[PDB]
Amino acid sequence: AVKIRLTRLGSKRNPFYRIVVADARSPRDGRIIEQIGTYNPTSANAPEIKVDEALALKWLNDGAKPTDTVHNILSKEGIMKKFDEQKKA
Amino acid sequence: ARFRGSNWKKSRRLGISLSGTGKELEKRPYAPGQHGPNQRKKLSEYGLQLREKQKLRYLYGMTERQFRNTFDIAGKKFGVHGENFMILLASRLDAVVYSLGLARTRRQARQLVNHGHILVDGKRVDIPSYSVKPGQTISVREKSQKLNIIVESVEINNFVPEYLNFDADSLTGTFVRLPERSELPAEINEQLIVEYYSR
Amino acid sequence: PTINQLVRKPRQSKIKKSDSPALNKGFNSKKKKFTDLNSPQKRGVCTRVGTMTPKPNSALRKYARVRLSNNIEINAYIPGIGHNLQEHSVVLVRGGRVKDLPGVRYHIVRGALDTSGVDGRRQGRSLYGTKKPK
Amino acid sequence: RNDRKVYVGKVVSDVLVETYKTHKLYGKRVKYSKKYKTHDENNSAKLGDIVKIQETRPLSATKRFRLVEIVEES
RNA sequence: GGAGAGUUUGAUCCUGGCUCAGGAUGAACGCUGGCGGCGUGCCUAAUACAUGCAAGUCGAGCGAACGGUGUUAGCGGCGGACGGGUGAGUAACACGUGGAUAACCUACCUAUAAGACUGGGAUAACUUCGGGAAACCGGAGCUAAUACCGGAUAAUAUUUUGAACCGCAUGGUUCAAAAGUGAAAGACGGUCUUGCUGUCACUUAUAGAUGGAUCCGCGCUGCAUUAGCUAGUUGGUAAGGUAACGGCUUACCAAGGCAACGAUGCAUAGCCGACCUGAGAGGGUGAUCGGCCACACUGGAACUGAGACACGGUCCAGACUCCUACGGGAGGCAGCAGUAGGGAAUCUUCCGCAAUGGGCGAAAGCCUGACGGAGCAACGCCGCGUGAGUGAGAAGGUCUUCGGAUCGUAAAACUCUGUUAUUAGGGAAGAACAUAUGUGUAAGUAACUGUGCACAUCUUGACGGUACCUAAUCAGAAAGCCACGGCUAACUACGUGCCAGCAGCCGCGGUAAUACGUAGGUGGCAAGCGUUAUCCGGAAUUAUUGGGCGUAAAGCGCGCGUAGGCGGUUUUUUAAGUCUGAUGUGAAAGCCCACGGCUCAACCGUGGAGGGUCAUUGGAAACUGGA
Ligand SMILES: [K+]
Ligand SMILES: [K+]
Ligand SMILES: [Mg+2]
Ligand SMILES: [Mg+2]
Ligand SMILES: [Mg+2]
Ligand SMILES: [Mg+2]
Ligand SMILES: [Mg+2]
Ligand SMILES: [Mg+2]
Ligand SMILES: [Mg+2]
Ligand SMILES: [Mg+2]
Ligand SMILES: [Mg+2]
Ligand SMILES: [Mg+2]
Ligand SMILES: [Mg+2]
Ligand SMILES: [Mg+2]
Ligand SMILES: [Mg+2]
Ligand SMILES: [Mg+2]
Ligand SMILES: [Mg+2]
Ligand SMILES: [Mg+2]
Ligand SMILES: [Mg+2]
Ligand SMILES: [Mg+2]
Ligand SMILES: [Mg+2]
Ligand SMILES: [Mg+2]
Ligand SMILES: [Mg+2]
Ligand SMILES: [Mg+2]
Ligand SMILES: [Mg+2]
Ligand SMILES: [Mg+2]
Ligand SMILES: [Mg+2]
Ligand SMILES: [Mg+2]
Ligand SMILES: [Mg+2]
Ligand SMILES: [Mg+2]
Ligand SMILES: [Mg+2]
Ligand SMILES: [Mg+2]
Ligand SMILES: [Mg+2]
Ligand SMILES: [Mg+2]
């Protein structure tokens, strides 16, 4: 299936994550469909979430499913609330 | 430091006072070693560009690898390459600490930075090659504001250059703005060093 | 030539040749075939040590006959004053022809495999396989 | 919809589509030609006629084009 | 953004090769060796492989068994076609770039709609009787299901009647309107009414998304001392076949098809983004990271499946290895480690699923040599040390024109520091969650449970007591390598006597060697320094940019002439080249610029720029081409 997930970048002990839409079978750091943001869990003060809200809802409405961590990221940006509100309405 | 040999021998060979004072080229303004008094011939074209490079390199006390890397860094900014190189060398935390007056010699200013006695903008900087930017603040760590090396150097209030500001009572310095070629040593014909790295 | 001649028959650069051809070949024993690998050195066995006279120069230059690990026979020079080599010695061979000695295109590495370092050497020891004294 | 590639050429057996390949190094244009085996339906065209062709699905082992229009008679 | 020098002569100017100074590496070797960070590490034998691990999961689909709510083997579902490895084959639509499919397939996911009715019979497990060293195989019975199979209902799918409209030829989109034909399943809960109902699961249809397939334009290494190649070959008709078009296959008919614009054959090679070099034009490379392809001991097949003709599946043939009680059985590291071998040369039979990702599961969770980490190696890059300040010419070494000179402010002496080191105390981030528990809200409900969404509480770290920080003590443990005639920075003495030796080139050594060896001194670098190998540069030394051919290498002995190349003046026209906009595309990483985080720097991250001989489309008309 199509996933919204985190691909690892950065260096040893210093992880940086891009938020990508990718086929489940694609290797973690390989072929993607579309990048929709970034995520930096080791930042100084705030985890530095940078999600493209219009792109995230297009893929969510197209059947793409987030991983557990990406679901928390999208929730912290209110994308999950807008997805649920737009589905019922 | 890195090179821990006789700075007197190096100043005599290069024909430039490394201490900035002139006490090394005092009695024997000729090359060290057995053939010192015996006057040698002229210097080749290569031997003139090379001697210019060693003048700068041994003044700031750097290895050739780090010296050439700074040259490449300086060659990427807009302006005259050779002058940008001289400005970058003067901005070393190695040389800022000495130019402010916190140490007697350029080698003493290196051991202070290396041993963690110096702060930059309030935080400790241990790296002598640290490239200080204009506006930064260099100070002494609290446990070292009363040390004889720093105290004795400060009371000899020398000509602190006009691109720097120091406050002796505060033991704190300010990197006001980038130096100009006139505020930097005039015994170095930097056009030869640019040619040296062209061949 | 004309542009049309160049289009019909383009330029061709001269092919460069190697000064140490015996180093740039391997041997697959299983398939009994020669490879091309560019080695920096090759192991070998001394078939015949001895001396040879130079081409203006006059001396007795020490050398060995070596069968390399790729089954190629070469003449290799033995640098330094005195050596410990004889027949059936296992030597490491590097490139570098010795002028004045026709047919000797390689050097034996001092201080590698069975070859000893030069005895009593104190300057440029790493070129002659001699450990630091004291 | 979408557009299928169109060529104009001369029948060499009853289509030659001579084009130019600019030289990579010297910049001179050199004429080159490629023969396009095409489907003529009712054997209408003949040798030397200048014809228009359009790309189609594979029709045989080597035929990928259909003759649409005859331009200049033999 | 572009540097030269040495060497042919008694001397010269040319021509011309050779050599050297630069950069780089998956390097190796020699001498030497303190630390930290980040990266990299079988290039050779696609050689053979001992041992362990690299793919399972679901009891909320099912029966049984054993244990006291748990678990085991089995049936069943899904996964095992991913992820990981390798570059043997391949000169080809394999790959890059740009298109087409009105000739295509698509599990899981999402959305919408309509459903999910009624029967049946097996069989593994199991029990029992055997046969075999084993691997395993037979006989008898037994039994379940979301396993399997009948029947019913369901059409957009198929046939025929047509019709309307449209396209790029085959054709395509609807409108019908009759005939055949095709499904499904329960589990766990709530309410209870045994009816309704929640979640997950099931069937059909249609879309979306994803992934895959086919075709086509252009681009792709040498050798012509490789010139002929092909007979399903090339086209047609028909049938068969496929997801699909098609000589894809067969039958019959015709004699085509390819090639000097290089067919065919031989050899070599996975291709690209990128990487190294270069002023650029170019030249060289494909290890690491990413995309695509191919392969899985060798060769041939097929099965299951949405997907394989399948690395850790099956069948067959072969080579090889292993067990055997001789009847018979077993195996495939180009997964991660590791071994042997080959080699100049390339690492631990480590820790953990804490993070990211993947499979299964309602979930808890389980599995995961992917991965995240640790270990080894100066292999590379970056950073920091091996002390600092003051200190007039001590001794000792070396040279001496025995006055002295030099090593040398160097040492000692006096103070100072603790980066590092040792000892001790503290000690991050990387962690987001999920589950569960509460409230609130949305949809739905007759209502509830549940579901989606939100907030609040809870648990979880391999690295690791690591990074880092604080205190104490001590200059104490921490410098080597090459060179010094010229190119080319840096010279003296002694020994040797064309010997021993040196050497990239010129060349040096035959009794006063700055070139051999050592010593002192000096120069260049520095945890490295040299040597070798290889590639680009210098090399305008294949010259498009950017060379030549009277005598230096170089005008065919000379005609005629084919292909090709090139071609006088003007007008009209065209728009292939040419020029100029628009649109799309040229992934990400990389390079370059800017900014941010790492104490700095390497490095990491973010935003731009660049890179096409690309395609499609609108303009211009001087030149080249066409009329
Ligand atoms: K001469
Ligand atoms: K995990
Ligand atoms: Mg946090
Ligand atoms: Mg490392
Ligand atoms: Mg290999
Ligand atoms: Mg093998
Ligand atoms: Mg079980
Ligand atoms: Mg389904
Ligand atoms: Mg079923
Ligand atoms: Mg190959
Ligand atoms: Mg050039
Ligand atoms: Mg099947
Ligand atoms: Mg498999
Ligand atoms: Mg295996
Ligand atoms: Mg292995
Ligand atoms: Mg070996
Ligand atoms: Mg997970
Ligand atoms: Mg396991
Ligand atoms: Mg080493
Ligand atoms: Mg000199
Ligand atoms: Mg020597
Ligand atoms: Mg002598
Ligand atoms: Mg010499
Ligand atoms: Mg010597
Ligand atoms: Mg270093
Ligand atoms: Mg070269
Ligand atoms: Mg060159
Ligand atoms: Mg010439
Ligand atoms: Mg001529
Ligand atoms: Mg002649
Ligand atoms: Mg001639
Ligand atoms: Mg003539
Ligand atoms: Mg003749
Ligand atoms: Mg950094």
Coordinates of N, CA and C (backbone and C1' of nucleotides) in Angstrom, one line a residue, chain E residues 142-182:
Chain E
rC142 P -15.0 -43.3 9.9 O5' -14.7 -42.2 10.9 C5' -14.6 -42.5 12.3 C4' -14.1 -41.3 13.1 C3' -14.4 -40.0 12.6 O3' -15.7 -39.6 12.9 C1' -12.1 -40.1 13.3
rU143 P -16.6 -38.7 11.8 O5' -16.1 -37.2 12.1 C5' -16.0 -36.7 13.4 C4' -15.2 -35.5 13.4 C3' -15.4 -34.5 12.3 O3' -16.6 -33.7 12.5 C1' -13.1 -34.7 12.7
rA144 P -17.2 -32.8 11.4 O5' -16.4 -31.4 11.5 C5' -16.7 -30.6 12.6 C4' -15.7 -29.4 12.7 C3' -15.7 -28.4 11.6 O3' -16.8 -27.5 11.7 C1' -13.5 -28.9 12.2
rA145 P -17.7 -27.0 10.4 O5' -17.0 -25.6 10.0 C5' -16.8 -24.6 11.0 C4' -15.6 -23.8 10.7 C3' -15.5 -23.2 9.3 O3' -16.2 -21.9 9.3 C1' -13.5 -24.3 9.8
rU146 P -17.2 -21.6 8.1 O5' -16.4 -20.6 7.2 C5' -15.9 -19.3 7.7 C4' -14.9 -18.8 6.7 C3' -13.6 -19.5 6.6 O3' -13.1 -19.4 5.3 C1' -13.2 -17.4 7.3
rA147 P -13.4 -20.5 4.2 O5' -12.3 -21.6 4.5 C5' -10.9 -21.4 4.2 C4' -10.3 -22.6 3.7 C3' -10.9 -23.2 2.5 O3' -10.4 -22.6 1.3 C1' -10.7 -24.9 4.0
rC148 P -11.4 -22.2 0.1 O5' -11.9 -23.7 -0.4 C5' -11.0 -24.6 -1.0 C4' -11.7 -25.9 -1.3 C3' -13.0 -25.8 -2.1 O3' -12.7 -25.7 -3.5 C1' -13.4 -27.2 -0.3
rC149 P -13.6 -24.8 -4.5 O5' -14.9 -25.7 -4.8 C5' -14.8 -27.0 -5.1 C4' -16.0 -27.8 -4.9 C3' -17.3 -27.2 -5.5 O3' -17.4 -27.4 -6.9 C1' -17.7 -28.0 -3.3
rG150 P -18.4 -26.7 -7.8 O5' -19.8 -27.4 -7.5 C5' -21.0 -26.8 -7.8 C4' -22.2 -27.6 -7.3 C3' -23.5 -26.8 -7.4 O3' -24.1 -26.8 -8.7 C1' -23.3 -27.8 -5.3
rG151 P -24.3 -25.5 -9.5 O5' -25.8 -25.0 -9.2 C5' -26.8 -26.0 -9.0 C4' -27.8 -25.6 -8.0 C3' -28.2 -24.1 -8.0 O3' -29.2 -23.9 -9.1 C1' -27.8 -24.7 -5.8
rA152 P -29.1 -22.5 -9.8 O5' -29.7 -21.5 -8.7 C5' -31.1 -21.6 -8.2 C4' -31.4 -20.6 -7.2 C3' -31.3 -19.1 -7.6 O3' -32.3 -18.7 -8.5 C1' -30.4 -19.5 -5.4
rU153 P -32.0 -17.6 -9.6 O5' -31.7 -16.3 -8.9 C5' -32.7 -15.6 -8.2 C4' -32.1 -14.4 -7.4 C3' -31.3 -13.4 -8.1 O3' -32.1 -12.5 -8.8 C1' -30.2 -14.1 -6.2
rA154 P -31.6 -12.0 -10.3 O5' -30.4 -11.0 -10.0 C5' -30.4 -10.0 -9.1 C4' -29.1 -9.3 -8.9 C3' -28.3 -9.1 -10.2 O3' -28.7 -7.9 -10.9 C1' -26.9 -10.0 -8.5
rA155 P -28.9 -7.9 -12.5 O5' -27.9 -6.7 -12.9 C5' -26.6 -6.5 -12.2 C4' -25.6 -6.0 -13.2 C3' -26.1 -5.7 -14.6 O3' -25.3 -4.6 -15.2 C1' -24.3 -7.3 -14.7
rU156 P -26.1 -3.5 -16.1 O5' -24.9 -2.7 -16.8 C5' -24.2 -3.3 -17.9 C4' -22.8 -2.7 -18.0 C3' -21.7 -3.7 -18.0 O3' -20.6 -3.2 -18.8 C1' -21.6 -2.3 -16.0
rA157 P -20.3 -3.8 -20.2 O5' -18.9 -4.5 -20.1 C5' -18.3 -4.8 -18.9 C4' -17.9 -6.3 -18.9 C3' -18.3 -7.1 -20.1 O3' -17.4 -7.0 -21.2 C1' -18.9 -8.3 -18.1
rU158 P -17.8 -7.4 -22.7 O5' -17.9 -9.0 -22.6 C5' -17.5 -9.8 -23.7 C4' -18.4 -10.9 -24.0 C3' -19.3 -10.8 -25.2 O3' -18.7 -11.1 -26.4 C1' -20.5 -11.6 -23.3
rU159 P -19.0 -10.3 -27.7 O5' -20.4 -10.9 -28.2 C5' -20.4 -12.3 -28.7 C4' -21.8 -12.7 -29.0 C3' -22.6 -11.8 -29.9 O3' -22.4 -12.1 -31.3 C1' -23.9 -12.3 -28.0
rU160 P -22.3 -10.9 -32.4 O5' -23.8 -10.5 -32.6 C5' -24.7 -11.4 -33.3 C4' -26.1 -11.1 -33.1 C3' -26.6 -9.7 -33.5 O3' -26.9 -9.6 -34.9 C1' -27.4 -10.2 -31.3
rU161 P -26.7 -8.1 -35.6 O5' -28.0 -7.3 -35.2 C5' -29.3 -7.7 -35.7 C4' -30.4 -6.9 -35.0 C3' -30.4 -5.4 -35.2 O3' -31.1 -5.0 -36.3 C1' -30.6 -6.0 -32.9
rG162 P -30.2 -4.5 -37.6 O5' -28.8 -4.1 -36.9 C5' -28.4 -2.7 -36.9 C4' -29.3 -1.9 -36.1 C3' -28.9 -0.4 -35.9 O3' -29.2 0.4 -37.1 C1' -29.6 -1.3 -33.8
rA163 P -28.2 1.5 -37.6 O5' -28.6 2.7 -36.6 C5' -29.9 3.1 -36.3 C4' -30.0 4.1 -35.2 C3' -28.9 5.1 -35.2 O3' -29.2 6.2 -36.0 C1' -29.1 4.2 -33.0
rA164 P -28.0 7.0 -36.7 O5' -27.6 8.1 -35.5 C5' -28.6 8.9 -34.9 C4' -28.1 9.6 -33.7 C3' -26.7 10.2 -33.9 O3' -26.8 11.5 -34.5 C1' -26.8 9.0 -31.9
rC165 P -25.6 12.0 -35.5 O5' -24.4 12.3 -34.6 C5' -24.6 13.3 -33.6 C4' -23.4 13.2 -32.6 C3' -22.0 13.2 -33.2 O3' -21.5 14.5 -33.6 C1' -22.2 11.5 -31.5
rC166 P -20.4 14.6 -34.7 O5' -19.1 14.0 -34.0 C5' -18.5 14.7 -33.0 C4' -17.4 14.0 -32.3 C3' -16.2 13.6 -33.3 O3' -15.3 14.6 -33.5 C1' -16.9 11.7 -32.0
rG167 P -14.4 14.5 -34.8 O5' -13.2 13.5 -34.4 C5' -12.3 13.7 -33.3 C4' -11.4 12.6 -33.0 C3' -10.5 12.2 -34.2 O3' -9.4 12.9 -34.4 C1' -11.6 10.3 -33.3
rC168 P -8.7 13.1 -35.8 O5' -7.3 12.3 -35.6 C5' -6.4 12.1 -36.7 C4' -6.2 10.7 -37.0 C3' -7.4 9.8 -36.9 O3' -7.3 8.7 -37.9 C1' -5.7 9.1 -35.4
rA169 P -8.5 8.6 -39.0 O5' -8.8 7.0 -39.1 C5' -9.4 6.5 -40.2 C4' -8.8 5.1 -40.5 C3' -9.3 4.0 -39.5 O3' -10.5 3.5 -39.9 C1' -6.9 3.9 -39.7
rU170 P -11.6 3.1 -38.7 O5' -10.9 1.7 -38.2 C5' -10.7 0.6 -39.0 C4' -9.7 -0.4 -38.4 C3' -10.1 -1.0 -37.1 O3' -11.0 -2.1 -37.2 C1' -7.9 -0.3 -36.9
rG171 P -12.2 -2.3 -36.1 O5' -11.5 -1.7 -34.8 C5' -12.3 -1.0 -33.8 C4' -11.7 0.3 -33.4 C3' -12.4 1.0 -32.3 O3' -12.1 0.5 -31.0 C1' -11.9 2.5 -34.0
rG172 P -13.2 0.1 -30.0 O5' -13.3 1.3 -29.0 C5' -12.2 2.1 -28.7 C4' -12.6 3.6 -28.5 C3' -13.8 3.8 -27.6 O3' -13.5 3.7 -26.2 C1' -13.9 5.1 -29.5
rU173 P -14.6 3.3 -25.1 O5' -15.6 4.6 -25.1 C5' -15.2 5.7 -24.4 C4' -16.4 6.6 -24.2 C3' -17.7 6.0 -23.8 O3' -17.8 5.8 -22.4 C1' -18.2 7.4 -25.6
rU174 P -19.0 4.9 -21.8 O5' -20.2 6.0 -21.6 C5' -21.5 5.7 -21.6 C4' -22.4 6.6 -22.3 C3' -23.8 6.1 -22.6 O3' -24.6 6.4 -21.5 C1' -22.9 6.9 -24.6
rC175 P -25.6 5.3 -20.9 O5' -26.8 5.3 -21.9 C5' -27.5 6.6 -22.3 C4' -28.4 6.4 -23.5 C3' -29.2 5.1 -23.5 O3' -30.3 5.2 -22.6 C1' -28.2 5.4 -25.6
rA176 P -30.4 4.5 -21.2 O5' -31.2 3.2 -21.5 C5' -30.7 2.2 -22.3 C4' -31.4 2.1 -23.6 C3' -32.3 1.0 -23.9 O3' -33.4 1.4 -24.8 C1' -30.6 0.9 -25.5
rA177 P -34.9 1.0 -24.5 O5' -34.8 -0.6 -24.6 C5' -35.1 -1.3 -25.8 C4' -34.8 -2.8 -25.8 C3' -34.9 -3.4 -24.4 O3' -35.6 -4.7 -24.5 C1' -32.9 -4.0 -25.3
rA178 P -36.2 -5.4 -23.2 O5' -35.6 -6.9 -23.3 C5' -36.4 -7.9 -23.9 C4' -35.6 -8.8 -24.8 C3' -34.8 -9.9 -24.1 O3' -35.6 -11.0 -23.7 C1' -33.4 -8.9 -25.7
rA179 P -35.1 -12.0 -22.4 O5' -33.9 -12.8 -23.0 C5' -34.1 -13.7 -24.1 C4' -32.8 -14.3 -24.5 C3' -32.0 -15.0 -23.4 O3' -32.4 -16.3 -23.2 C1' -30.6 -13.5 -24.7
rG180 P -32.9 -16.8 -21.8 O5' -31.7 -17.8 -21.3 C5' -30.6 -17.3 -20.6 C4' -29.3 -17.7 -21.3 C3' -28.1 -18.0 -20.3 O3' -28.1 -19.3 -19.8 C1' -27.4 -16.5 -22.0
rU181 P -28.1 -19.5 -18.2 O5' -26.7 -19.0 -17.7 C5' -25.5 -19.5 -18.3 C4' -24.3 -18.7 -17.9 C3' -24.2 -18.3 -16.4 O3' -23.9 -19.3 -15.6 C1' -23.7 -16.4 -17.7
rG182 P -24.2 -19.2 -14.0 O5' -23.0 -18.3 -13.4 C5' -21.7 -18.6 -13.7 C4' -20.8 -17.5 -13.1 C3' -21.0 -17.2 -11.7 O3' -20.3 -18.1 -10.8 C1' -20.8 -15.2 -12.9

